[PDB]
Each structure stands twice: as C-alpha cells, then as structure tokens.
C-alpha cells in the first residue's frame, strides 16, 4: 500500500504526475533520486521558476525519453530508435527551441544533456559574444556512456529534422560539437540526481549564452544550495500536499 501525496501539476491541469510516500523515501541522504522525483521537480522549475521567455525557448523531456530512445525492417539504425519516441514531439517543433533538456540515467548515475541552439548552422560571434549549435553534457562526475549518448542524440536530431523539415541536415561531431563545461562536482555519493536538478535550476536562473570554450561554471551555485536541496524538495512536496488538500 502506497499513498499518493500529490499530483503535479494538479488538475484541472492535464499532464499530472503522481508523487507517493515511497518516492519521498529516495530523498533521504545516500539514496539515488528516482525518475518520479526528477521529472516532478523539473516540471516544477518549468512552471514556477523559469521566465516566460525561457519557457517558450526551452523544452524538457521526461526521463523516459532517453530510456525509450534506447531499448529493444527497411529502416536504418538511426530511424529505428527514433520511431520509438517519434510521438514525444507530435505537437512541438524542437528546432524552434534554444534549449532541449534530456535527463539521462546510466548505471544509476544521473547526468544531463542539453541541446543548444539547434537552429544555428555554425558558430557565430561579435563586445565578445559566442553561440553555436551544440550538445552540452552537465555531469556532477563523468559517465562512461556519454559518447554513446551524444551520438544517439545527433542521430535523433537527423531523423527528427528530416521528419519535420523534409530536408537533409548533417549533425556531426564537428557540425554540432559536444562540450563538457566545468561545473561543480558531486561531493556525496548518490547525489548526481540532486546536481542534475540544481543544474537546470541554475541554468534557468542564469542561462548559458556564451559558448566560448572553456565554459567556466565552477562556481555556478553555492555549495550550501546543494547541501539543503534534498530536504528543500521534500518540504516542497509536503507543502503542496497540504495545498492540494486545503482544496
């Protein structure tokens, strides 16, 4: 027996996610954050923390996106896995977006893949500014499957661009470089999920506009923000539990 604490967003809203007491259990120190907690908070950030602009210019996939994109006739390898998640963008063109976030969990470890400026063809710059189509990898440590992830996304984009734009664009290692900006690293084991959430939160509070390598984000956020984050999230869930009860 489990108790559903909240449904976020709560109805009348439509895309509601349920969060139970068992889900809260993973908020304990030394516990890996599960899918439900990751997707919940990311939804919360998009609905309560991102500026209207950032919301329109961004799209966040649930953790099931990459999972489904990788698991198993005339189709090639690239278009076989894309068929598995072709529905996730039925009513949304991702090439109109500046940022597309993809939560990734490999071997219980969480890391983030952020596709940036997919509409740019190459690197642009002017007052020094710099942007380019690319894939950022934000990891509180380092994952072994990263390159496999980056290659799957480039191939995901090729198919998706061919399905929507009806043309051929080549998303390659040089075409759309993958970068690992230097961000704060994990201190405690089991905390990669907490870092993933903090990354998106910090990204929304202060987006990455300059892509001049190397991207320095070593002090992106204070260390104490991470220290209290698991608890802050638990308090948020219970705070909403009482709100969805008060009505």
Curated annotation (Swiss-Prot):
Catalytic residues (UniProt): 109, 139, 192 (nucleophile)
Effect of residue 36 to E: Reduces deconjugation activity
Membrane-spanning residues: none
Annotated spans, Protease: 17-247
Tree of life domain: Eukaryota
Compartment annotation: Cytoplasm
Ranges in a coiled coil: none
Family affiliation: Belongs to the peptidase C48 family.
Described function: Protease that acts as a positive regulator of the cGAS-STING pathway by catalyzing desumoylation of CGAS. Desumoylation of CGAS promotes DNA-binding activity of CGAS, subsequent oligomerization and activation. Deconjugates SUMO2 and SUMO3 from targeted proteins, but not SUMO1. Catalyzes the deconjugation of poly-SUMO2 and poly-SUMO3 chains. Has very low efficiency in processing full-length SUMO proteins to their mature forms.
Identification of the protein by name: Sentrin-specific protease 7
Species of the source: Homo sapiens
Taxonomic lineage: Eukaryota, Metazoa, Chordata, Craniata, Vertebrata
Encoding gene (name): SENP7
């Amino acid at each position: 027996l489990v108790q559903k604490l909240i449904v976020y967003p709560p109805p009348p809203t439509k895309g509601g996610l349920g969060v139970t007491n068992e889900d809260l259990e993973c908020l304990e120190e030394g516990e890996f954050l599960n899918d439900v907690i990751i997707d919940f908070y990311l939804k919360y950030l998009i609905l309560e923390k991102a500026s209207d602009e950032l919301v329109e210019r961004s799209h966040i996939f649930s953790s099931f996106f990459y999972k489904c994109l990788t698991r198993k006739p005339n189709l090639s390898m690239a278009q076989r896995r894309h068929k598995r998640v072709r529905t996730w963008t039925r009513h949304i063109n991702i090439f109109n977006k500046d940022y597309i976030f993809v939560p990734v969990n490999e071997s219980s470890h969480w890391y983030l893949a952020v596709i940036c400026f997919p509409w740019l063809e190459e690197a642009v710059y002017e007052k020094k500014m710099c942007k380019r189509p690319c894939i950022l990898i934000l990891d509180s440590l380092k994952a072994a499957s990263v390159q496999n992830t980056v290659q799957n996304l480039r191939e995901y984009l090729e198919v998706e661009w061919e399905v929507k734009l009806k043309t051929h664009r080549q998303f390659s290692k040089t075409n759309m470089v993958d970068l690992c900006p230097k961000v704060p690293k994990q201190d405690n084991s089991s905390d990669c999920g907490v870092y993933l959430l903090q990354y998106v939160e910090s990204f929304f509070k202060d987006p990455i506009v300059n892509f001049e390598l190397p991207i320095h984000l070593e002090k992106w956020f204070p260390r104490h923000v991470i220290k209290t984050k698991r608890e802050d999230i638990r308090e948020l869930i219970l705070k909403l539990h009482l709100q969805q009860q008060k009505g």
